[PDB]
Amino acid sequence: AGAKDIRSKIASVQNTQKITKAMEMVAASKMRKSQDRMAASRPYAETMRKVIGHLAHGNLEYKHPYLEDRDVKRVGYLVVSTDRGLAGGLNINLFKKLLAEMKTWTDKGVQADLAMIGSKGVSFFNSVGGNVVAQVTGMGDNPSLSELIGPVKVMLQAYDEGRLDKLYIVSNKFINTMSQVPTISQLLPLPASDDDDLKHKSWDYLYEPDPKALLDTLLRRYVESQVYQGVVENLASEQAARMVAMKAATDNGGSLIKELQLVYNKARQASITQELTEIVSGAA
Amino acid sequence: AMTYHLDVVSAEQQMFSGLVEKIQVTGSEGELGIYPGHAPLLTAIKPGMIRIVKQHGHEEFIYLSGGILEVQPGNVTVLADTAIRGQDLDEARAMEAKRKAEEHISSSHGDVDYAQASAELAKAIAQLRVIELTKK
Amino acid sequence: GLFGGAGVGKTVNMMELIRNIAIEHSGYSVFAGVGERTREGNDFYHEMTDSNVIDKVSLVYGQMNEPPGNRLRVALTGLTMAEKFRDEGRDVLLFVDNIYRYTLAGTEVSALLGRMPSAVGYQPTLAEEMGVLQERITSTKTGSITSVQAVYVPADDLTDPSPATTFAHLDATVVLSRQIASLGIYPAVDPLDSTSRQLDPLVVGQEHYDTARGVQSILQRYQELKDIIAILGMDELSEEDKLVVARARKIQRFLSQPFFVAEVFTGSPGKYVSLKDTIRGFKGIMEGEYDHLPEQAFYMVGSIEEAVEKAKKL
Amino acid sequence: LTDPSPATTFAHLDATVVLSRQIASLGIYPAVDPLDSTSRQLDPLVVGQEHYDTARGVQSILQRYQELKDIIAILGMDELSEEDKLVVARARKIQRFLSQPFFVAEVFTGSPGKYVSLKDTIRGFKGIMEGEYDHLPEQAFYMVGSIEEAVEKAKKL
Amino acid sequence: VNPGISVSRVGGAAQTKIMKKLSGGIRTALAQYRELAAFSQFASDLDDATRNQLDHGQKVTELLKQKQYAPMS
Amino acid sequence: VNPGISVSRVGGAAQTKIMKKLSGGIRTALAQYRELAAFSQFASDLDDATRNQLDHGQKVTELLKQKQYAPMS
C-alpha cells in the first residue's frame, strides 16, 4: 500500500533494509570467521622476540645495530588500510593521528616520510598532504610477508642508513570485537625487546653468526611479523564496524522512514474528500 | 623416536609441532646429523627437504624456503619464514613503489561482502526527489 | 475491549468463562451475535455440548442471510432479556460478535435513506448508539451488568469512528498475538499492552503495583536479552541474562495456569488461579529467588502455588 | 497556502511573503519565510554585485545544503566531503546569523535589539560563506546582527 | 498459483489419508526455499542448510508443478 | 526550462542546414550530463567514463544559459 512517494519510499526502504541486513549478516559472519580464524599470528613475533631477546644478552650486548637506527633529521609516519566499504572511524583517526602526530612531531624541525598502505593510503596521504614515499597496492584481507616487501624494502634505506630516526606507525587497531582503537606506536627506531635479557645464556653461547645476522634478520622477522600480523585489525575493524553499523543503523536510520508510512494511514482519509466533490455533482 | 620439542613457526601461524629426536637436517655449514643431546647452536635453514623423524618414528621430509635454527638449552625453535630474501625479489619494490606511487596508484582488493552491494547502493542511492520529501 | 488475532478462541473463553465465572460469582452469562456465518452455527453450537453452557447462555445470533433491519435488530433481546437477571439478584454478562453489522447496517441504512450524516463514510448516529449503549453496561445495586466488547475496528482506521469509539467507549483492551500461542503455552494473551488504568498505576495497592511494576519491568527489560542478543552470541551473558532469561522464561511459561476449559474437553485440571499466589509469588520468586523450577515440570501449574511442589517432587 | 489568498495575493500584489513553521519552530530571531518570494529590485541591473553574489551564493548553498538531506541525513556523514561541511557551515552560519531583533522583536524574546547597516550585512556575505569569517561557531552566530555582533561576539567570546 | 497467497479453509486434512499427514508441507519448502534462496544477492556463501533447499525446493517445485491443461488423476 | 520535457512538434526540420546539422547537443549533452550526477551517488564512483564526458557534456552546457538579456542574433 502506497501513494506515489510512499510506494517508492517503501520499496527503497525495504530494498535498502534487506540489502543492509544481508550485507551486514554476510560481513558479520565473514568478519567473525576470518577474524576468529586469522587472529592468532604470534608465532613469528613471539618466537623471534623471545628467542632474540632471551639470547641477545650474551651476544648482542657488545654491538647492536638496532639502537641508533638512523640519524635524527626527519620524522616517519604511516597510514591505515581500508579496502572495504564504510571503514568507520579509520579516516578520522588516521588523518587526525597522522596529521597531529606528524605535524606536532615534525613541527619542531623535522621532515615528513609517511608510508601509504592499502586503499586509504592512496587518498589519505597522496590526495591530502604530508609525504608519499611508497604506496603498497594490492593488499586485501589476506596479508603476508611476501607481498609486503615495499615497506621493509622502501623503509630499509630511510631507517637503517640515516634519514628518519623516530617514526609513528599509525594503524587502525582493534582490542575487542567492536572497539576499533587506532594505535600509533613509534617504530623504525628501537624495539627494546627486554623480555628475558636480564640474565645470561645458561647453555652454549656459540653460533655461526654475528651482529649483522642477529640485527638484520631479527628486524625483518619482528617488523614483518608485527606489521603483517597487526593488519588483521583493519579488515576486522572495518568489516565489523560496517556490519554492526549497517545492522544497527538499518533498524533505526532508514527504517525510521517507515514511520512516515504511518502518516499514509491518514492519507486514505483524504480520499474521503474525493467524495465531498460528489456532493456538488453526484449527490447534488 | 621423540625427545625434544622441535616446533616450527612460520610467518603467520604455526608451521609444525610435536617432539623430535634424531633430526638429520642440514645446518648452516652443510649437511649435519643432529639428534637428542645437542647444545645451543643458532644456524640457518635454506631450501631443501630434510628427512627428520617426528613422533613415533615419522620420518617426514619438511621442505621450506627460509628457516632460522634457534637452538637453546634443550629446545629447538625453528623460526622459519614464508620466503627468503636475496637477489632481486625485494629490489623492485623501490622502483615499482616509487614509480607506481609517484604518479597514480590504484588499489583493488577482493571484498566479497562489499562488491555485491554495488547495484543496491548505487541503484538505491539515486532519486533524491522522493527520499528528501520530508517537510520541516 | 478485545484485540489481537487468534490463539485463544471462543472455546477457551466460553469454556473457561462458563465454569469459573459461573461458580465463582452468582450470575448468568449470555451471548449475542450479529453478522455471522450460516455454517458456523452448525459447528460452534456443538461446543455447547462439550462444556455445558447451553443451559446457562442465550445464543442470540442473526447470521447474515437477512437484510440490515432484520439482522441488526438484536439490541432489544440483549438489553430487554439481560435486564431481568441483573436487576433481580444475579449479574448479567453479554457477549457481542463484531461491529460490521451495526456499523455497516447503521451507516448504510442511516446514510442511504436520502439524508446527509457524518464524514469519511460514517453516520451521525454513532455517538448516540456508541455512547448510550457503551455506558449502559455499568454496575448497579442489584447486580453488575457486564458485556464483552468484541468490536472489530476497520483495519486500524484512526480517522473513522472505530478507533475513537472503540478506544474511547471501552475500558481495557487485551491483545492476543501468535507469539504466546506458537511456542506451546496455555494462555495466548500476552502481558504487553493488556492492562487497564487502575492495574499498573498508584490506584490499587502494593500487590498490584509491585506485581505490575516487577512483571512489566522484568518482562520489558528481559524481552531484549533473549531476542536482540541471539544475533551476536551468548558469551557476554552474566547474571542479568541468566536470571532474567530463566525468570522470564520460567515465569512466562509457568504463569499460564489452566482453567476449567480443558477439564471437560482435554483432561487437564488446574481449577482456578488465586490472586495471592500470582500476586505474592511472581514478584519475589520470579526475579532471583528459589531457582529450582525448570521448564518442563513448571508447566500446567496453578499460578505459583502448584509450582513450588513441582520443583522438588518432579 | 493552497487557497485563493496565496494565488490571488501572490500575483495581484507586490511581494508574496509568508510565515513558515521552520523559522519560528527552530528559535530564530526572524520567524518569517524569506525564501518564498522577493521584490523586483533583486536582479542584476537594479541590484548589484552584493545582491547578485549574495543571492546566488545563498541560494546555491541553501539549496544544496537544504536539498542534500537525502544523502547526508539517512547515510549520515559517511559519504560526505567539502560540499557538506562548506554548505552546512555557510548555510547554517548565514541562515542562523542573518536573523536579528528589531526593537519590538527584541522585547518579545529575550535578546537585545541593535540596528544593523547595509555595508556590514551586504559585505559580510563574501567572508562568512567563503572562508574568511567562517571560523565562528553556532553559539557565536546566534542573535547576531551583521558583522559587529558576529565579529565582536565571535572574537570576544 | 502464487507461493503462500493461495490458501483455502479446510486444507489437506479433509481429503484422503495419504494427502493429509504425508503430503502437506508447501509452506516449509516454499518458505524455506524461497526465503533461503531469494536472499542470495548480497549474502553469498551458502552453507549446508541453504544449499539443500535450492535443489529440493527448485527441483520439487519446478518439476512437481502441473502445466497448462494438464490432467491429474 | 528543463531539458528533456521540451519536445517540439517540428523539431529541427523548420530551420537551415547549420541549425539542423549542428544540433548534436540534445540527447548526447542532455543524457550524458545526467549519468554523471546520478551515477556518483555511491562512495565516489567516478572513473574514465564519468570524467571524460563531464568536461564536454556537463561543463560545456553549464555556461550556456539564457539570462535576462538573451539575444539570439
Locate the domains of chain C by residue range: 1-198, 199-314
Query: How many whole angstroms separate alpha carbon D10 and alpha carbon A76?
Result: 65
E43 touches chain A (CB under 8 A): yes
All residues of chain D having their beta carbon less than 8 Å from the beta carbon of residue A246 are: none
Does residue A98 contact residue A78 with C-beta atoms inside 8 Å? yes
Q: Is C78 within any annotated ligand binding site?
A: no
The distance of A254 to chain D (nearest Cα, Å) reads 6
Nearest CA in chain B to F36: B126
Please spell the DSSP secondary structure of chain A, one letter per residue: ---THHHHHHHHHHHHHHHHHHHHHHHHHHHHHHHHHH----HHHHHHHHHHHHHTTTTSSS--TTTT-S-SS-BB-------SS--SSHHHHHHHHHHHHHHHHHTTT---B-EEESSHHHHHTTTTSS--SEEE----SS--SSS-HHHHHHHHHHHSSSS-SB--EEEE--SSSS---EEEE--SS-----SS-SS--SS----S--HHHHHHHHHHHHHHHHHHHTTHHHHHHHHHHHHHHHHHHHTTTHHHHHHHHHHHHHHHHHHHHHHHGGGGTT--
Does residue A137 contact residue B107 with C-beta atoms inside 8 Å? yes
The reply to whether A267 and A242 lie within a common domain is yes
In single-letter form, the type of residue at position C229 comes to: I
Task: Look at B131 and D70 and tell me if their CB atoms are within 8 Å.
Answer: yes
The distance of A252 to chain B (nearest Cα, Å) reads 16
**Residue listed under C-alpha cell 564496524:** A241
E42 touches chain A (CB under 8 A): yes
Q: Which long-range contacts (CB under 8 A, 24 or more apart) does A272-278 make?
A: A272/C119, A272/C120, A272/C121, A272/C159, A275/C121, A276/C119
Q: What is the DSSP letter of B65?
A: S
Task: Look at C159 and A247 and tell me if their CB atoms are within 8 Å.
Answer: no
Q: Is C84 within any annotated ligand binding site?
A: no
Query: How many whole angstroms separate alpha carbon D81 and alpha carbon D76?
Result: 12
Of C292, C289, C283, residue with least CA distance to C214: C283
Fold category of C199-314 in CATH = 1.10.1140
Query: How many whole angstroms separate alpha carbon C182 and alpha carbon A215?
Result: 69
Task: Look at A86 and D78 and tell me if their CB atoms are within 8 Å.
Answer: yes
C-alpha grid cell, residue C43: 459447528
Q: Where in chain B are the domains?
A: 3-89, 90-136
Does residue C291 contact residue C311 with C-beta atoms inside 8 Å? no
SS (H, E, C) A109-164: CCCCECEEECCHHHHHCCCCCCCCCEEECCCCCCCCCCCCHHHHHHHHHHHCCCCC
**Residue listed under C-alpha cell 535576462:** F68
Q: What is the DSSP letter of D33?
A: B
Q: What is the DSSP letter of B20?
A: E
Taking any CB pair shorter than 8 Å as contact, residues of chain F touching chain B are: 38-39, 41-43, 45
Quick one: C145 exposed, middle or buried, by C-beta within 10 A (0-12, 13-18, 19+)?
buried
Q: Is C56 a catalytic residue?
A: no
C-alpha grid cell, residue C197: 488504568
Q: Which long-range contacts (CB under 8 A, 24 or more apart) does E40-45 make?
A: E41/A19, E41/A22, E41/B116, E41/B120, E42/A19, E42/A22, E42/A23, E42/A26, E42/B113, E42/B116, E42/B117, E42/B120, E43/A22, E43/A23, E43/A25, E43/A26, E44/A26, E44/B112, E44/B116, E45/A26, E45/A29, E45/A30, E45/B112
Name the 3-class secondary structure at B79. Answer: strand
C201 contacts: CB under 8 Å, gap ≥ 6: C209
Q: Is C311 within any annotated ligand binding site?
A: no
Does residue C230 contact residue C241 with C-beta atoms inside 8 Å? no
Q: Into which CATH architecture does domain C1-198 fall?
A: 3-Layer(aba) Sandwich (3.40)
Query: How many whole angstroms separate alpha carbon D97 and alpha carbon A39?
Result: 52
Backbone torsions φ then ψ of C111, nearest 5 degrees: -100, -15
Q: What is the DSSP letter of D56?
A: H
Does residue C31 contact residue C58 with C-beta atoms inside 8 Å? yes
Active-site choice (C19, C24, C37, C141): C37
Q: Do the bridges between strand B14-16 and strand B8-9 make them parallel or antiparallel, or are there none, so unpaired?
A: antiparallel
The distance of A224 to chain D (nearest Cα, Å) reads 32
Name the β-bridge partners of B23.
Answer: B52
Query: How many whole angstroms separate alpha carbon C16 and alpha carbon C261?
Result: 4
The reply to whether A67 and A201 lie within a common domain is yes
Query: How many whole angstroms separate alpha carbon B98 and alpha carbon A135?
Result: 8
Number of Cβ atoms within 10 Å of the Cβ of A95? 19
Task: Look at E44 and B112 and tell me if their CB atoms are within 8 Å.
Answer: yes
Residue where a domain terminates, one of A168, A189, A205 = A205
Q: Is B70 left (phi over 0), alpha (psi -120 to 50) or beta?
A: beta
C216 contacts: CB under 8 Å, gap ≥ 6: C191, C195, C200
E41 touches chain A (CB under 8 A): yes
Backbone torsions φ then ψ of B70, nearest 5 degrees: -105, 85
Which among A265, A272, A275 has CB closest to C158? Answer: A265
Residue environment code for B103-129, b if the CB has 16+ CB neighbours within 10 A, otherwise e: eebebebebebbebbeebbbebbbeee
The reply to whether A51 and A104 lie within a common domain is no
Which among D43, D71, D79 has CB closest to F68? Answer: D43
Of A251, A259, A257, residue with least CA distance to A17: A251
A138 touches chain B (CB under 8 A): yes
All residues of chain F having their beta carbon less than 8 Å from the beta carbon of residue D79 are: 42-44
The reply to whether A270 and A194 lie within a common domain is no
Question: How far from A264 is each of A1, A6, B40, CA to CA, in Å?
Answer: 9, 7, 81
Quick one: A43 exposed, middle or buried, by C-beta within 10 A (0-12, 13-18, 19+)?
buried
Does residue A167 contact residue A73 with C-beta atoms inside 8 Å? no
In single-letter form, the type of residue at position D52 comes to: Y
Does residue B125 contact residue A16 with C-beta atoms inside 8 Å? no
Of A193, A202, A210, residue with least CA distance to A59: A210
Of C207, C182, C97, C84, residue with least CA distance to C147: C97
Does residue A159 contact residue A220 with C-beta atoms inside 8 Å? no
Technique behind this structure?
cryo-EM
Question: How far from C218 is each of A153, C213, C253, D94, CA to CA, in Å?
Answer: 61, 8, 14, 50
Query: How many whole angstroms separate alpha carbon B79 and alpha carbon B85?
Result: 15
- What domain range includes position A261? 1-59+206-284
B126 touches chain D (CB under 8 A): no
Q: What is the DSSP letter of B90?
A: G
In single-letter form, the type of residue at position B96 comes to: E
C-alpha grid cell, residue A121: 593510503
Query: How many whole angstroms separate alpha carbon C111 and alpha carbon A273?
Result: 17
Q: Is C4 within any annotated ligand binding site?
A: yes
Q: What is the DSSP letter of B89?
A: G
Name the β-bridge partners of B127.
Answer: none
In single-letter form, the type of residue at position A187 comes to: L
Residue environment code for C188-204, b if the CB has 16+ CB neighbours within 10 A, otherwise e: bbbbeebbeeeebeeee
**C-alpha of A89 from chain center:** 9
Which H/E stretch holds residue D50? helix D49-67
Does residue C216 contact residue C194 with C-beta atoms inside 8 Å? no
Which H/E stretch holds residue B5? strand B4-5
Of A218, A215, A187, residue with least CA distance to A51: A218
Residue where a domain terminates, one of A176, A205, A234 = A205
A104 touches chain B (CB under 8 A): no
Could you give the angle at which helices A149-159 and B92-102 cross, rounded to 10 degrees?
Answer: 100
Name the 3-class secondary structure at B14. Answer: strand
**Contact: chain C with chain A (3+ CB pairs below 8 Å):** yes
C37 contacts: CB under 8 Å, gap ≥ 6: C63, C64
CATH superfamily label, B3-89: F0F1 ATP synthase delta/epsilon subunit, N-terminal (2.60.15.10)
Nearest CA in chain D to B131: D70
Does residue A171 contact residue A230 with C-beta atoms inside 8 Å? yes
Name the 3-class secondary structure at B77. Answer: strand
The reply to whether A137 and A184 lie within a common domain is yes
The length of chain C is: 314
Name the β-bridge partners of A32.
Answer: none
Number of Cβ atoms within 10 Å of the Cβ of D118? 9
Of A186, A179, A188, A177, residue with least CA distance to A97: A186
Of B41, B19, B11, residue with least CA distance to B28: B41
Nearest CA in chain D to F43: D79
Query: How many whole angstroms separate alpha carbon B89 and alpha carbon B65?
Result: 14
Query: How many whole angstroms separate alpha carbon D53 and alpha carbon D50?
Result: 5
Backbone torsions φ then ψ of A129, nearest 5 degrees: 165, 180
In single-letter form, the type of residue at position E9 comes to: R
- Computed on alpha carbons and rounded to an integer, the radius of gyration of chain B in Å comes to 26
Number of Cβ atoms within 10 Å of the Cβ of F58? 16
| Cα angle, residue E53 at apex, residues E48 and E54 outer, rounded to 5° | 105
**Residue listed under C-alpha cell 448508539:** C129
Name the 3-class secondary structure at D89. Answer: helix
Please spell the DSSP secondary structure of chain C, one letter per residue: -B-S-SSS-HHHHHHHHTTHHHHHS---B---BSS--TTGGGTHHHHTTTTT-TTS----B--SSS-STTTS--HHHHHHHHHHHHTTTS--EEE---SHHHHHHHHHHHHSSS----STT--TTHHHHHHHHHSSS-B-SS-B-EEE-----SSS-SSSHHHHHHHHHSS--B---SHHHHSS-S----STT---TTSSSSSS-HHHHHHHHHHHHHHHHHSHHHHTSTTT-STT--HHHHHHHHHHHHHHHHS----SSSTTTT--------HHHHHTTTTTTTTSS-TT--SSTTSS--TTTTHHHHHHH-
Name the 3-class secondary structure at F15. Answer: coil
Q: Do the bridges between strand B68-71 and strand B59-62 make them parallel or antiparallel, or are there none, so unpaired?
A: unpaired
Query: How many whole angstroms separate alpha carbon A144 and alpha carbon A148?
Result: 7
Backbone torsions φ then ψ of A120, nearest 5 degrees: -80, -20
C-alpha grid cell, residue E56: 529440493
Backbone torsions φ then ψ of C47, nearest 5 degrees: -60, -30
The reply to whether A165 and A220 lie within a common domain is no
C-alpha grid cell, residue E49: 542448510
Q: Do the bridges between strand C146-148 and strand C93-95 make them parallel or antiparallel, or are there none, so unpaired?
A: parallel
Number of H helices, E strands in chain B: 3, 9
Nearest CA in chain B to D68: B132
Quick one: A16 exposed, middle or buried, by C-beta within 10 A (0-12, 13-18, 19+)?
buried
Which H/E stretch holds residue F21? helix F17-21
- Computed on alpha carbons and rounded to an integer, the radius of gyration of chain F in Å comes to 15
Residue environment code for E28-67, b if the CB has 16+ CB neighbours within 10 A, otherwise e: ebbebbbebbebeebbeeeeeebeebeeebeeeeeeeeee
Query: How many whole angstroms separate alpha carbon A205 and alpha carbon A197?
Result: 14
Task: Look at A265 and C156 and tell me if their CB atoms are within 8 Å.
Answer: yes
| Cα angle, residue B98 at apex, residues B93 and B104 outer, rounded to 5° | 120
Name the 3-class secondary structure at B15. Answer: strand
Dihedral of alpha carbons C104, C110, C115, C117, sign: negative
**Residue listed under C-alpha cell 475496528:** C153
CATH assignment at residue A21: 1.10.287.80
Q: Which long-range contacts (CB under 8 A, 24 or more apart) does D119-125 make?
A: D120/D145, D120/D146, D120/D147, D120/D148, D121/D145, D121/D146, D121/D147, D122/D50, D122/D51, D122/D54, D123/D50, D123/D147, D124/D150, D125/D50, D125/D53, D125/D54, D125/D57, D125/D58, D125/D94
Interface with chain D: mutation pick from F41, F42, F66, highest number of D CBs within 10 Å = F41
Nearest CA in chain B to E40: B116
All residues of chain A having their beta carbon less than 8 Å from the beta carbon of residue C228 are: none
Does residue C268 contact residue C262 with C-beta atoms inside 8 Å? yes
Number of Cβ atoms within 10 Å of the Cβ of C277? 18
A21 contacts: CB under 8 Å, gap ≥ 6: A246, A247, A250
- Stated in angstroms to one decimal place, the resolution of this structure is 8.5
C-alpha grid cell, residue C154: 476497520
Query: How many whole angstroms separate alpha carbon A53 and alpha carbon C63?
Result: 93
**Residue listed under C-alpha cell 627468503:** B84
Backbone torsions φ then ψ of C139, nearest 5 degrees: -80, 145
Does residue B13 contact residue A41 with C-beta atoms inside 8 Å? yes
Backbone torsions φ then ψ of A241, nearest 5 degrees: -70, -35
The reply to whether A274 and A164 lie within a common domain is no
Q: Which residue precedes each gap in chain E (C to N above 2.5 Å)?
A: none
Number of Cβ atoms within 10 Å of the Cβ of A76? 30
Q: Do the bridges between strand B8-9 and strand B76-79 make them parallel or antiparallel, or are there none, so unpaired?
A: parallel
The distance of B85 to chain F (nearest Cα, Å) reads 37
Number of structural domains in chain A: 2
B107 touches chain F (CB under 8 A): no
Task: Look at A22 and E39 and tell me if their CB atoms are within 8 Å.
Answer: yes
Residue environment code for F17-53, b if the CB has 16+ CB neighbours within 10 A, otherwise e: eeeeeeeebeeebeebbeebeebbbbeeeeeeeeeeb
CATH of domain D42-157: 1.10.1140.10
Residue where a domain terminates, one of A205, A220, A252 = A205
Which H/E stretch holds residue D104? helix D104-107
Backbone torsions φ then ψ of A192, nearest 5 degrees: 55, 50
Query: How many whole angstroms separate alpha carbon C57 and alpha carbon C60?
Result: 9
Half-sphere exposure of residue C178: CA atoms within 13 angstroms, side-chain side: 2
F4 contacts: CB under 8 Å, gap ≥ 6: F30
B96 contacts: CB under 8 Å, gap ≥ 6: A150
In single-letter form, the type of residue at position A204 comes to: D
Q: Which long-range contacts (CB under 8 A, 24 or more apart) does C263-266 make?
A: C263/C19, C264/C15, C264/C19, C264/C50, C264/C51, C264/C52, C265/C11, C265/C15, C265/C50, C265/C51
SS (H, E, C) chain E: CCCCCCCCCCHHHHCCCCCCCCCCCHHHHHHHHHHHHHCCCCCCCCCHHHHHHHHHHHHHHHHCCCCCCCCCC
Of A126, A114, A151, residue with least CA distance to A231: A151
Task: Look at F68 and D79 and tell me if their CB atoms are within 8 Å.
Answer: no
Does residue B49 contact residue B61 with C-beta atoms inside 8 Å? yes
B13 touches chain F (CB under 8 A): no
C-alpha grid cell, residue F24: 548534436
All residues of chain B having their beta carbon less than 8 Å from the beta carbon of residue D69 are: 132, 134
